[PDB]
Symmetry: D3
Subunit: 260 residues, 6 copies
């Protein structure tokens, strides 16, 4: 059991724990407490012995525009204490929830993902794309921030070092063609951007077919070994990322910038 969140729902169908970002009018921008909620959902899926796959789906034309900076603009003895509680807290927690998750984590990329939300996409085990207009953007250089959500590790791992530097240093998207050239996307469904619902249903339909005859505990057993390849690097990066970001918040540059 868990509280309700009006921007994120979940349901369980057979071996699938399905998380749904359901705030398309605001491009599924997420506040700090929504990221914590996501982490709590993962931890709930992780403790459910009937669950073998955790599927993250979204709504409308964006997967997620990233952190809601209306919530950032909105009691603390210092700026450091403020950002330790408001930024360090939620980033380190949600990122860890994704890094350690034992169930097969699948992202249905119905549209672009930005920032911390795009970082979480990059931590999923498998990504399916609605169409060739999807992209990931990590706009840290334009926001006055640094890598978040384990992207220090995930982006070189999944897109290559040089590509990662070009994208991160100059605030350029990891476009669909770059995703495909790195095998980031396992299947493109080539559906119109206006029907994330049909896309989400189609992915689930195919997953139900693909799991037939499989010994699902083998999936988890394999994931347990595969995770060990980079678990340490991800855990190292998580604490360093959140702590090194603090000087950027406390300097004030990100507030000054994402005001406009």
């Amino acid at each position: 059991e868990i509280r309700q969140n009006e921007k994120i729902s979940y349901r369980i169908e057979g071996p699938f724990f399905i998380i749904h970002l359901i705030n398309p009018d605001n491009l599924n921008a997420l506040e700090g407490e929504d990221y914590i909620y996501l982490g709590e959902l993962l931890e709930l899926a992780d403790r459910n012995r009937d669950v073998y796959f955790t599927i993250i789906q979204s709504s409308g034309r964006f997967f997620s525009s990233g952190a809601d900076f209306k919530g950032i603009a909105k009691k603390y003895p210092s700026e450091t204490s403020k950002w330790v509680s408001n930024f360090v807290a939620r980033n380190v927690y949600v990122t860890d929830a994704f890094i350690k998750h034992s169930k097969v984590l699948i992202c249905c990329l119905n549209g672009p993902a930005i920032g911390l939300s795009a970082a979480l996409v990059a931590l999923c085990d498998i990504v399916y794309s609605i169409n060739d207009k999807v992209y990931l953007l990590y706009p840290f250089a334009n926001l006055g921030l640094i890598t978040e959500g384990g992207t220090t590790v995930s982006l070189p791992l999944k897109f290559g070092t040089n590509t990662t530097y070009e994208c991160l240093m100059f605030n350029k998207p990891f476009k669909y063609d770059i995703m495909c050239e790195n095998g980031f996307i396992s299947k493109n469904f080539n559906m119109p951007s206006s029907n994330a619902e049909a896309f989400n249903a189609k992915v689930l339909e195919e997953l139900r077919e693909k799991v037939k005859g499989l010994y699902l505990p083998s999936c988890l057993g394999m994931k347990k070994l595969l995770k060990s390849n980079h678990i340490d690097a991800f855990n190292k990066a998580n604490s360093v990322e959140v702590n090194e970001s603090l000087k950027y918040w406390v300097d004030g540059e990100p507030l000054k910038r994402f005001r406009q």
Copy 2:
């Protein structure tokens, strides 16, 4: 040094050539054939005249993997330690540590542990674009073997590996090419593996001309150090974590049909 009717070998100058020669059973290998492969690699590795170890096969498959017939002691655990754990840790280690340049001539699909050994090779040449690697662990009620925990993400990427391993889908030729797994496709007919094998060796004889072969080995020694610890770690964990699967009985139940 002992004889094996399913696997031969010969030495031609700096090449130690291993040949899987049981095409009628798609070069399926029993436990003791995997051990023999390990012994052959270890033999090639002690030979100071050998710089390249080339694994070639026969017929339409490179190898269909572990022989299900050979699959079918005071406990179940003891039995599987002797039968599975022993053979897998040994052969996998022989490949991981091999100091000579290890080349696979992929004359057809490779499955399971055999496909794992293909992924541990340094260089892979394909006969044609119909080759594939399949790691059917999820379908067999098993987990990663032969260092695939490390080798598959390394050589195919993490996401691609999950899609293939979680859903028992092949690493097809196109995915091999997109990841540079294959260094040359020879585009030869599958009806003649022998001609493919001869052509690869002909090409290799030409490519080695004028090179300082000790440099090849010196370079490999350093290159190997990139992932040696990860492979060694993966080897002991893979073999020990598979035990619960064998003991549970699920693979045997599935292996019959």
Copy 3:
């Protein structure tokens, strides 16, 4: 810093631009030129106004690698000689690239070979003048082994199997292999008769691209990115340089370097 006739530098805003300016000799570099490169990187790294270190070259080659004439040219042993002439300089220049905190951009106006190609592979971003560029690491044909962190950089940036094919058989990492691995961030598709025009267009484009950005974020992100492989590079540097010694002392490279 001293002047070097073969390598210039200048600062344009946040950019520290190194320019190999010996096109007549395909920008082949002697030991002291590599040290000089290391010294420039270290100077760039201490300049708080610099955020990007851009390495550019001249003519039809980026660099043909180590100058063979310099190798042919007061030591009590062969070991002592090569510790001084090879080990010293490789370990220093490689370290300078590995640790550099500024964003390192290579403008590849043509082929790079050997240690120079190793340095290209240690850069963070690479732009190509056209599709005739390649990298060649001819260690097997020279009687040497991996240099300049290629032990780590080549598998990292080109894949393990591709790296073996190329290194074991002295084959180039051609443009298509570079593109298939995302090694080149942009190909400018300009004539190789005007490296200078290429060099200027890269800088024009970079001036455009940095606009609006918080440049300290670039360095903050690089600081974290560097931590992925820093240990592997440092360990590789030490081992490459020392393990190469037996090749030099045996004499095979010198026997080959004049054929």
Copy 4:
């Protein structure tokens, strides 16, 4: 920086001295006091005249650890509450110690417990007032797990087997165990009725010891020394803080923290 009534600081030459000044409460620290400590370390770290960061305390205890009253005291879930109150502050203060570039010296005027004892174990050098000092990590009796990098620091500085005996059974790392592991560089053998005299004698002795030394060498050496375990500490920090959450959310610690 803001003033804190429980923690002062000052700079004497190359020394940045932090002083816990709440002896009446055995220098128990609330969440915001740990953050404040982190902030002081970070300030010390940015001061180019500082080479040593000296942490001193007052009275008969170094610190009794986290203030229980503060723990007993606007969140949509228990998880959100503890991410904010525990995870945030532990991950921040631990990181501040782990990364600190200045030589970190603890003047142990008495026992340290819990997170405070974890911070003592992250210091580079520890001096004891007398042989009655101990460190206690009471996590097993509080329903918690390792904090403040003790996952790494305790096996590193006390040995694996000793660490298990102490952590598993809630037993102190006593003075004799500290001495047997070289944890204490000097015991001053002074009365515990005058932490202040102890604190002053340490600083007197340090003024003596730094004379003649090239202080940038100290930091250069620490930079390299830190690289031995930096990855392990950073990875431990992340995991300790997140894995502790289930203990807080289950409620066992709160059930125990008022008995």
Copy 5:
């Protein structure tokens, strides 16, 4: 779950107690007894009521190590893969990964692989100051086993380990104490291991009172991560590198006398 006349076990509250009960042969263990030990640890590890796994022995020795009698297949390599490699990778892994707090009651000397298992325990209590650990690998024509590559430098220091291992010298009680290997010496007579074993359990029952036992396991989970990769790497390398020693024949030649 099967019975073993040389090793019993019982569960008392949160303690899973293993008892070596063949004091007449100094608790020498054959290959299948090492496997049984592994199975017992794995059994204790699945038991949610168990927080501590306590290994106790009998008589004057904890264990004299591998049974030389049990020491005395298409090749030598295959034989030693099945007989040595299999058992060693398995038992060593069972100790390395064990999630419960692992306590050894050292009632006397431990030798060889048994001494290696003592070094993998989390906490060690000694009966008296005459206990020692001996790793006689150099004398037997073998190399490190049971993760001692890692455990001995970790727990005794690097230099001390070289002196002992290179020259076949015991890790005596004084060296154990100087390195904090022993958490308590009970100073009881060697003529009564049973009374020592009972006293340790009595003390442990008292020490656990009022503790949150899940914290013990949570802490161990994190602590284990410090060296888990090194131990796993060491396990596969140790077993595979010993093979050449067994195959050469030197250990057998020496084991007879």
Copy 6:
């Protein structure tokens, strides 16, 4: 075969390759080319299949006072190039020779060792002491230098972190009692400091006894595995140590200091 060096001799007796520092009048201070010679001797011992132990012995009352700074005080386009050739070169080479050596490396500590020479002592597998007056001093803080010869790794490994900081930061010796409390010394022979010859002979005498009945290839096989524990850390530290020392040499502080 190898050139002669008037300050360092060697001989082979059975399985022992014995290196002898034989310049007691100058406390076995070593110049750059002498450190290279030491490295070459190790590499020679390493290629000799009859050799299983490499024993380093010295002469007089000091094992070695460290680097000869008459040779440092005594053609290059820059200060950097000078020190790359004169310092970086020899340190990286000799340190590597010790780190990778496959034979059991035993140091007979006949007296104090200082600086790079003391670093090499700390890289040996086994150390025997003549008496309780031996010490190791790493005077880098007083010389204006940093850790050398893998001491970044070896000193925390063999003496503990905290002890190492106290000694290195304040230029204090690792005295005999500290060595013993860390099991650094395997045996103290308790002989007068005036007879390093009798000490050196006694160690060899005991080693000849101790090796009897051993399968010597087992010693090397075990060392091969044991080395793998820290080999990467040592190799990482070697390149970083030599490169980070450069700024100290080029700044000039060490020349200014060890002038006096």
